[PDB]
Design a protein around this ligand. Structure first.
Ligand SMILES: *[C@@H]1O[C@H](CO)[C@@H](O[C@@H]2O[C@H](CO)[C@@H](O)[C@H](O)[C@H]2NC(C)=O)[C@H](O)[C@H]1NC(C)=O
Lengths: 48, 36
């Protein structure tokens, strides 16, 4: 009852949906609580 | 490379009074004339 803590995944192309593998990305970002560095594709305009 | 310079006298904890230090700007925003 002492175990190597970490396991393989059984990923065969015969796996059913949901037992099949998925690639995952999580996008994390804070908003408006500093100066900023990544932005959406919008044209600026002059200062009025 | 590194070496254990273990010639070190086993001095006790030493202490001083941190009267009013370690205050820091709590968030990345501007404020003025206000008790926040
Ligand atoms: C400096 O001295 C310390 C002991 O005060 C050394 O620590 C030992 O290091 C070995 C491996 O090299 C461990 O097997 C021992 O368990 C350690 N001792 C203790 C009490 O735990 C240290 O390696 C020395 N380092 C050098 C650069 O000489």
């Amino acid at each position: 009852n002492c175990y190597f803590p970490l396991q393989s995944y059984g990923f065969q192309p015969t796996n059913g949906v949901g037992y099949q593998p998925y690639r995952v990305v999580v996008l994390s970002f804070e908003l408006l609580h500093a100066p900023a560095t990544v932005c959406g594709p919008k044209k600026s305009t002059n200062l009025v | 490379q590194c070496v254990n310079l273990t010639t070190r006298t086993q001095l006790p904890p030493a202490y001083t009074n941190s009267f009013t230090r370690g205050v820091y700007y709590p968030d990345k925003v501007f404020r003025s004339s206000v008790l926040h």
